[model samples]
Target chain A: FRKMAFPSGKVEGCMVQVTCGTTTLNGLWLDDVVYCPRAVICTSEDMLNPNYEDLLIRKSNHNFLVQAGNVQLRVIGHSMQNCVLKLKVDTANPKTPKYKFVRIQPGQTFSVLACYNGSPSGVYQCAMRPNFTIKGSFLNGSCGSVGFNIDYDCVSFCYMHHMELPTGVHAGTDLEGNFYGPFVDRQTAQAAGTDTTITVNVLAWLYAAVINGDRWFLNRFTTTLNDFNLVAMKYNYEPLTQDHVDILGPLSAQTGIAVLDMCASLKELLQNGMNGRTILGSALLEDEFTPFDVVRQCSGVTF
Target chain B: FRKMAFPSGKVEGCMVQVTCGTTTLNGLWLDDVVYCPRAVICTSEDMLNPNYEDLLIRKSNHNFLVQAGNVQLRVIGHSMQNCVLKLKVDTANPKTPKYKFVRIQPGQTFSVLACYNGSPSGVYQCAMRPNFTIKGSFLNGSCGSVGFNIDYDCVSFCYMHHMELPTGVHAGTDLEGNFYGPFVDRQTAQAAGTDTTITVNVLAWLYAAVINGDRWFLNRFTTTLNDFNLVAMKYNYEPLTQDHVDILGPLSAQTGIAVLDMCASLKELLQNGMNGRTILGSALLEDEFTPFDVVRQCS
Candidate 1:
């Protein structure tokens, strides 16, 4: 009877944390003794804590996780009086998760994949880029529909680095089929491991050579088509043909990494301004490089 | 009144071709005479002859067609005896002309169009080329499902001259949508005409530059994608993914016309042969151009 809680049979003699029961996630009672998450009893020594609804649903990881074992409470319910209580606990699933996509475009089904020990690979291809639905599983549960969209990405070749990448991003996979990661870096991508691995070799973006409208349009047009085929072939998708390709208009994403051309997107926007034709898609439409939202990621000092 | 063939009127025709009903195509009957095809009667001057079932259907044209007009018959039936019977002749419809295709591969709907004052344009991409179904009207009737399969075409840029293209080929059209005429030349595919007209500028074929497998594969890959978008965007078909593209294995057709490279197909055939990898598709595996059937067109 000395210093044990009358009902819980937990020791109140230790740190106020274990005594108050605020951090106790779960406990077991059997044969006049109490069993708690190992973390609870260890904490009777000392602690502080914080929280969630379903711990596994979000990408964010808990800094400290309680060990999965059971440990004895410091006190026993072995009072001289005979009668006592018993408790059993278990949890069933909440329900099949409800999935509602915020914005799904056609051909949205095809997505570029990355594997992460912790979360989906995330490349910030500017803030407006649409969210992709991850198709496969993560850990033992679902990654649901949220994923990294390797397709249709148009990030600058400069900003793609491990240090620059969002933290805890996924590890890259074999560059099978058709992968064009202009925004993803090689050192950053690495391999979960392979041989038939394919990679891109961006030829120099001759800003001078492609000065004229027709020339510029064709250069990017060809590049985009090239990447389209890689993914299309890998996935067994039907030909998207030419008309549809035009609809997915930012041809910049297709540069095969521009092999070592100084990032000229800013220079390009200005050159066009020089031409005084702001309607670029019209060549059917540049000179001084206008630094647009996405292009800003390229400069050491954005204008 | 002298020798008018019984139901007709007449003159003793100048030549055997006119008098012999054999050469006659059609004749009009009027109040007192017969109006024979000027072609039939012109031969009253002189000629030889030939044959037919329907004049409009097949290609071969008539050597001498009668000018369409009304010329008086040589003599009148008015000199006739009492009431002679009159006749009227007219041809009727043959059914809607059922169409049956030989081999309709998927995506078989599109066709490369050419205009001939005569018949469909023909380019010999070395036979076995499947037929294309012409969508619009040709002349007056149907060119039907039989046409040039411009889509999956694999012809040597060399053999593409107008002289080499089959004779009496159709005149070309505007290069709208995503047109790729590697098999058809600029000189051959003249303007029907246009400006937004997109023309492919095939860069020099640096055969030496792309000897490795990956290099070779990407070269063709990117080129094909370039062309695919031209047409896909032009026609509005859904994405025929990367997997589908590989299934269409003759990636060679996608070349942007190697702008001005001397045809190295022979050298390539040999280079591949030297590699001893007879199975080129294998990565899956080629050197000296062991002249495969299609490669022969390149040289």
Candidate 2:
């Protein structure tokens, strides 16, 4: 006889088949046996590998890759328990080790995307604890550890919107109630348009992340931007004009060059002062930015 | 004897010099005078017309123009008292008449921008009451009344940001995790880019206005968008493109054509679904909209 418990209900005293991760198993029904409500039973052959239990975490079906700067981590959670996952980098260091925590519900998974400052590489150790308990200690709890190198100097891809305005194009307001342009040179206007477009997109992302407290979007966006900055710094591209595209072609796929250039110029702007962290607080803990403040900052730029 | 009390302090028994609106005045101050504090003492030359007292409201020094759709109202509030100003258009029409109110502080001036919907041409009457009163009624108070026509079809200037993207340029995400494009046609992409740019800018303005509870910004932005919609409906342009620019050039100065077109397209988008009224109750009365909600709506 076989028995199983699903999120819907329980199946008892029947020849029921079940699949766990990549393995299938058959077992006799034992009502008194202790089992995870959502666990996948593994056969002897499945347990031969030391990573067998790791597959149980993947059973949650919610896993993703998080990359920041030179760091990469595969974040997986189990559907059987409300777990609080803690990650510590440079754990051997008595002082100055970095730590972060993520709460994963029984059916949810979260990923912290890659960024240089947020997800730096070091000797990293991670542990999971039941969310509810007296000291919230990780004692007697399952743990996972890994060490990897993330090269900050390597070329990475970034995503940005490209804009091009024709030369001699006369259009719109200058915010000071003045007519904008009858451009004498197309190249100059084109360069300006590209800069303006990147600024708006970058600020929009930062505004939403820091002011609105949408970490999910911010993580993904920041990773992309950081990757591009890495490439931009190496290439020495200031405004990311068409001239820099050929030089960047050998570094990344043809499709990724545009993002690399745009990201590079935007990164320079942020380092110069647009770093949202300086204007707003690091959104890692709480939100300290406002929409009006962002508008005031961008108002000076003619985008 | 002439005397006055200014916001700063009382003007005692002395030759006091003061300016009201655009006129200067000289008066011998008297103690224990039954005059409004900060009231201007104008001479016979200042009272040459019935509108002389109206200039006293301009003493607040915070006067500015408020333009809505086709109507312009010079809303002048004096610093004499804390007043609650009420406006009623077509007071006789009980069914379709519109009403609005603004609270003015002792030293602050308030102006109500005109709009086609809110400021429709009718028998318009405005009154003021002490802000802290028992009944909050407009009875036993000074009133201003005017009747006029506002042309809705006239050409007006609007503001919008313009963006251009060349063909064969592949860049950015379209919110759905799809690779955008390598546009083979520049004109088609330009038209699309123009529309996308306007939508973002308009939403940005609306986002700030709703979150900040700034009626001033909302009024100007709304009227501009409304004016553009009026023109777009007449010209049958769904998304205001460069083609529509040439036609609108005769309507306003050439510089304003792009803004007019963009605002028209953005207004249409909002009316269809993006109007924040559903998500956030009218941002006019009080600020109930949060920055997070605004971001979610735009996100």
Candidate 3:
């Protein structure tokens, strides 16, 4: 009996019929008028049923009771002399609030303003934000609680849209004004200025092979095996760090001979470059724009 | 019959053809039967034909057809525009007779066989001697005159009778282990068991680039910038020298990068190795049997 809103034109033809004697209808969206030909009355109270029951809803009118322009009808069928009807309508329409969407990085929950929709509508993932609550039941178990006595601070989220939205991805900002999206591709994601994640199954390949291999790429600057670095105004990146390997490692795999070890002899390492054919064995570089220009003292062994 | 080496009983009528007439066959040899049976007592001589008339003679019975003293005329075209010839008498220890060359004008047939059966024979080479004159014609168009200047010293003379060879080369070895081959190819000269000469026209391209590049290949051992080496124990050849450049420079040119200095930085030298190419810009090296194992740093 948690009081819901007075039906608007959106819920036209939505019928809730309480048949004779003390019948309980789990949920209802009422139309413009409630008719009654019987004298039976219904009480209004928020009741709970423990039978693992569920109701299919058309719209998410969560601020049901909050919208004062609603009526509690004692009689809900076609009958004259509407009996025991107590109607209370506040007539005030609470403007639908808009919230800024943010892709909350971990450890930043305290920085976020309270999510207007609260833990019920829950935080959204960029993946889930594209088509939120459009055709499905609005409160999609939006409950925030997820693990052992902890809540996943509504991290990934999108703003709630009240009207029927056209198809395709929906974008928005969090209360903090950080942009978030359900972008189609990486380029769009980047342009959207959102956090970028490793495309490869990064966690799966954390095996020592890649781990140690990366450190080695990073360490090459410390040793003498490498040269030909681009020294820019920012950190010149002479040390060949993850920024380099993250690129090089994946690129190496594409080249037939995959070189995952940074500690490899320069000869063997470059051997892992490009097609193993061609008179001149080529190396693939992971820099921006054009390619790299590096030749070998015959396989980089000596020089 | 003058004293001659004992014959092995092999006498055959090998006629020395002549167009009989009043032709003064100044230096002539008689066969088994003196053709002039008419008592035409032909006066014999190791004489001169100053008028420059010519007579091509056959089989020199200089030892009167002696079984042991047969002559083999070996000629070598030489550079010098004037070759030297030597005599190897008895083809043995027979002391080597050295002498000056015989000079002559075109079309002048000079007889050069100072004595009959003197040094079994004479040989000619770019480096030979003795002006032998025992009725042989040479230096007319082109001929070899060597070691001994005087005709009386046929004891040391040449036996060259071939056509003229150009300046850059000459032909095979003389009987005394002396080289006489007119070699146009160095690989050929080296194979001819002769002294090897620097093929760069030797006296040329001796410029510092090559000279220094060579010194560098050798001294690579003394420097800190090197390590890899193919140490063959024959002589280890560790003290890199011309023996190497004598090989490398020419090879380097073909390698595209003409590296020709001996004292150049090892880096600078190999940089001159091969086609400047992609990823693995390669280098060329000179060695034997197979190619070289040396690598080149990028330029």
Candidate 4:
């Protein structure tokens, strides 16, 4: 049985009659079901898979093929608290280790080597970091149809509009005029502009997972991580306060990922008598080792 | 007497465990208020006449005399309802009207006259419509002073972003992909598409003020206000039902507007009598009327 409800047309008509003290007068019938064969109800999956051709083309294998050599893998995303992403190739082999890391910020990418040794036959998996604690995927380069490929086409492809990447390189800010920078750039002012310094620090911590992972990387680059604290010195202007810092500190420390103090850079930089220019340049190099037009060294173009 | 709030460096501390519970505390103290100098708030008038010449320049009459006979007006921002903008040569006289009835859609412009008419003696005042509101002061257009001559500009701007316009000229869709149209021109078809027609019938009652005020001179070249009913009758589908006719009949009668029934043009074109191309030319024209084109006999 099918029953459909629709708006009924009704109006009152005025009439006068001489009858008993109380009389039942009139009755009206209105059609409730308006037959509409065209109306369709779609399931959630049907709605999602609308324009199936477009979705299929989007998820198709469009990886680049090259001579089998060592290709670096990078995974990028945000909100890294006990989060980890790994690149696993040939899961059937127990001895073959995969590349993995925890905690990643936006605009940041981590590089790991997948030794292909010139053979093209392998299936690679770029899974979420540290379990499915958050949303993440490998992007830009690929791992053999499995290696990281570009998720979005442009920097503004995801959340950015008007084509401008937000000012800081940490947590992405929503379009609501909100500013959220997680870690600061301790390197040079120029490198501070992009997201390299913070990415390096996250990689440093992740590298520490394997033995002597922190030893291979120079502390000179790591020292620039302190510059993030220098940027935090301006926190008074921010809506955040010391109480926030106190709360986030113990919380991050408990997770083995320390939330560096806001004044961490200022204190470190001041003690070393490090000029802000060199610090800014180093931080800039941590991301991209570009020649900076800052103060130059006496012998070489250090700045 | 005045009191000072917490000093900048006062509240800086961490939490400590008390005997009962752990509580975070910070010390803050109000300092004695000293006598302060009187402060002044800046207003629009003050901003217009800033004392610091380095920061702002006050345009002198010499500058106005240098470039004579240029009149320009610009209207910016959203105009919701009833935009009436005007420019008049005589400021003291209220009845001597110049160009009028400039529709106030957002980002719309209306130019009244050319640059050659700029003369030092031309006194002009901009008057907006509806509420009869006026802005700024009368400036000499002939003197070449750059004051916004909003007369040829948007008049009564109202915030009608969501409010439906009076007629069928919808902000977005025409009629839910129903009823088709008189063959719109190629450019209009390219912009609006051939699949649907948004008729002036939907827009006529809205520009009612324009019609009643004699501002609809362009209507003479196109279909008359009467020919609309004839064109509306071309399509055959479901006529208005008794219930619908009952409700709309009185409303249309009161407004002197016609309520034409609409069915899917895609469905109507499939019938034997009519095809999509039939409505292409002056086929919809009545007996005594000339066909609407670039050079028509109607004029």
Candidate 5:
């Protein structure tokens, strides 16, 4: 029932932000939008433009450019009242940087620089304020942005990060379900993945805990035998493909996003050697990330 | 690529089995045949008889009684590898053990069942392994069986237990670049209040110990994002409802299968005042286990 609408009228720029109330998502605001020849569309008024596809790169101190193509800004449809959006500009590394915040509005639109060198080659971000109020009683919302770059240098591989919902938050319904979506930050996504998969806490609650000496909802709900069947079906679908490693291979690896560690080893190698661009074509516009045909077709990468 | 077959003909009181071969469902085998008065002739010798749904007197024993009306067994399709059959019976309970396996052959107008009780009672089941091979492979293989009694006493749910697959199976193709379905279990369904929903287990293999590792297949395959959307739409068709909780809620409470420890208080109430037979009927076939009115209404 809850739906977040994207920008309607075509603005004709690579990196664009959609705002509701007082919040804003500038190109430089989040790490996802990259500023390069292929991903972002820059304005002549400002040398730099923010990107949503990949991280923005500063070609020079002032001049910024988005590799010319279609770009999108992805945003979470749910509210994040306590969260903040951070932005960084053209810098060699991501760890330490001169970063700032860009305001995003729910119903409004804004733009920023992606490629910049001299005039701060527009590698920037729009960040949310922690425990900060935008206009009134609205929490910071989660969302995403995507942009197309014409050049090969702007795009790289895709990776996903997950995070757990807060205590008392249910992933399937009510407010909790609305709050959970994709991760703009890697750390949050990773943390979520580790916590949500187990049933230990749920079990402990059912054993001794009760209200009015009555079992709580925790005790009332039990896994059904049909659940076992469902689990079996899943195992059947992706049965161990390779005999060498222990379990079923990386779930996403079956798609385009390779199973690379956070240290960035696989990404570094692919970036340095490959001169061609990876075009990820998917069935639906917004779906799981897939690698370009060239990379997927290669045995080394596919294997 | 995998297929299951069934006999086109039917005999009311005969032993039947649905066979599965390398390619298709082979055929039906009949040990004996019987007939009933209320039976309807869809073909020669073959008739449909349904007993009144059964009621469980105890865990180990139960009774089936005969009554007026016709019981019909209709072989529909397949639920995964097993054949899907439908049953329509005239009586609510049978005087004798009216649960008889219906046998039918293909290309033969129809089969017959030797009518032993009054009127007629009928039921349907997907015969997986014939009686002969059942002893060896009963607890193995991909086939499964589900049976219901006329008196609504209990529902027999069975899953074949087998050793996990060995390792070294390499996938010859790229499975990535497609959407994957959701992970579904009875508990999760009740939690979400939706039966149509399924779940996706991204890291299911992590829980496996060394000995149980063979139970699952491991592969590095990728599902296209589009596939995710497809499954999402499929799940969306059915809205979350209380009916889901009626069935799945009690099962989770009893087995603690997917029980959420946080909601313990509520689970205790779910398991109260129910015996094994009552519990299974209420849990497994909550709506499906019943009289003609209940089954017809549910169907």
Candidate 6:
């Protein structure tokens, strides 16, 4: 008699699909552990398979595989052990590689929106390197509460990442099924963090503009909110909608930079006379005559 | 005259010509008082003289006449008395009248630019009301030093007014034959006063703009050096030459506003994020969208 696979209770609709190369497994029960007869998992070496170009999933370890698209998601970690999964995009370029780390605990899954590189349509690949020792004893650690129900849909464009944490676990606040959208560019992502973060970025950019005496950059950044408007309207929502995160729920600690703060800071610089020096300096210096000559001529004397 | 008045010592270039309607008198001595045959001085009632339309001059007491034109000068006050001359421009408009009181003392001929009406072209009229008791004793009063030679040329457009003090008197330091201005406009004149004066004016304008939320006024006043450059270039031979006034010499106590300080304060505001709230509120409200909505959408 052939060894029989035990029939665990059916999870029904509660199932996660894992795909590796041509092999795809759907309707896998969340509670029951299944042993695959075929060890059909794509390794980092299998990324070179031209036929599996569309199947860009790499089995990082015994647990998770890295999924890629506009955003990167780590699929499956059945080890029942807490671990940190490091994901990197544009891995071929050794000079400046982009990275993100997601903390995954036993029976809990997490994914970071690794879309900082401004190439939404381009073919991107994500490779995962799991580290089990970052935070030892994920159960007794400062993990707060765990084992909350989560259903996250990761896509691109309009709704790039949407997460629902019904019970809310492990220091994570209730996300309440809110959708975070189309990070059209890296700038929009960078602005989703904290107000303090936004302030620092704004000052840094402003100081650079002042030192370089680049009026165009100064005016473009401070005098107007054109860049902000684009990001807000692209996602089919008002820019102010981001502020509701504090009320609706806490933003993912991994949310992009705080862009609203940047916009606000720029507006203040323009409203006040702070940016006036740069604006006036540019105007006077660019003119053929000096301010002295203008005043003298206006006073009825030729200088 | 019925006595056939004979000429005294020849005044040469020192003679002042006085005219009373149809009668004209010349060769009046600076030291000797003369009786005019026609008494051409205005008696308050003559201020409405329809026949003297070309004459915008106002006679105040027996001393001086308020002259009008590009330069509003107190023509003749040879009495050498310490007094206060109250000058007013556009006096008819009680709603918004401009007044300046100039202190005139003996052996120290003082004149004001007195062109505050903002009209660079029109024949601006100045009316004077003299107060003889303003400064009791020119020597014993607050006057530091009294006698100083002064020659002022008042013109318009390119050179509105220029003053030369050979031996500068009063609490004022020695201007030493230096010529001040070309007051291009009233703003320039206002800024040319003491730093305290400039600070007050700047604060007033800034406060008004903030209250009204008037961006245009804020930008025009602060962004341009039109007001500041006028004051600086008018005083010294070089424009940015006032930097030396604080280092090399004492700033006229009447030096213009400290613009560099204002700029530095603004830079601090930007760096430290003090102005963030106002800026953010304006941006959201001005666009007909609530900041709440924008933040909600972006996140």
What digit string (tens of lDDT, one per residue) describes model 5 on residues B59-166?
110111212224322332211111122222232222223333322211111111111122111112121121101111111111111111222222122211111112
Which residue window of length 10 is worst by lDDT in model 3 chain B? B1-10
Residue A272 local lDDT, model 2: 55
lDDT at residue A264 of model 2 (Cα atoms)? 44
For model 2, residues B161-265, the per-residue Cα lDDT tens digits are 011233221221111111123222112343223211222223333443433333222222433545664544553333333443343333224223234433543
lDDT of 4: 0.20
Give model 5 RMSD, 1 decimal: 29.5
Candidate 4 docking DockQ: 0.01
lDDT of 6 by residue, B94-173 (tens): 11112221333211222111111111110111111111111111111111111111122111111112211222111221
Best by TM-score: 2
Those runs of model 5 whose alpha carbons end farther than 4 Å from true positions after fitting are A1-50, A53-205, A208-303, B1-299
DockQ values for all predictions?
Answer: 0.00, 0.01, 0.00, 0.01, 0.01, 0.00
Candidate 2 recovers what fraction of true contacts? 0.00
What would the per-residue lDDT of candidate 6 be over residues A1-303, giving only the tens digit for each residue?
A: 000110110111122233445443321212233211112343445423322322224334434332322232333332311111122222222221122223332111222111111111001111111111111111111111111111111111111121111111112211221112211111111222111112222233333333334434333233234555554344332333233323212111212223344354445453455533443232111111222212222232200
- The true-versus-predicted C-alpha distance at residue A37 of model 4, in Å, is 40
- Off-target runs (Cα >4 Å) in candidate 4 are A1-109, A113-264, A267-303, B1-299
For model 6, state the Cα shift of residue A139 in Å: 70
lDDT of 3 by residue, A1-303 (tens): 000111011111121332222422111122233221111122122122211111212212221221112333332222122111112222222321121223332111111111111211111111222122111112211111110001111222222221112322233233222323432211121222222222121221222223323323222322222431222112222233344455445435533223333323232334354243222111222221100111110111110
Model 3 per-residue lDDT tens digits across residues B109-138: 221221111111111112121111122212
Question: In model 1 chain A, where is the ten-residue run with the lowest total lDDT?
Answer: A1-10
CA lDDT of each prediction against the hidden true structure: 0.22, 0.24, 0.22, 0.20, 0.20, 0.23
True contacts kept of each: 0.00, 0.00, 0.00, 0.00, 0.00, 0.00
- Per-candidate TM-scores read 0.16, 0.18, 0.15, 0.16, 0.15, 0.16
Residue-level error in angstroms, candidate 4, position A227: 16
Worst 10 residues of 3 chain A by lDDT: A289-298
Candidate 6 deviant stretches above 4 angstroms: A1-303, B1-77, B81-201, B214-299
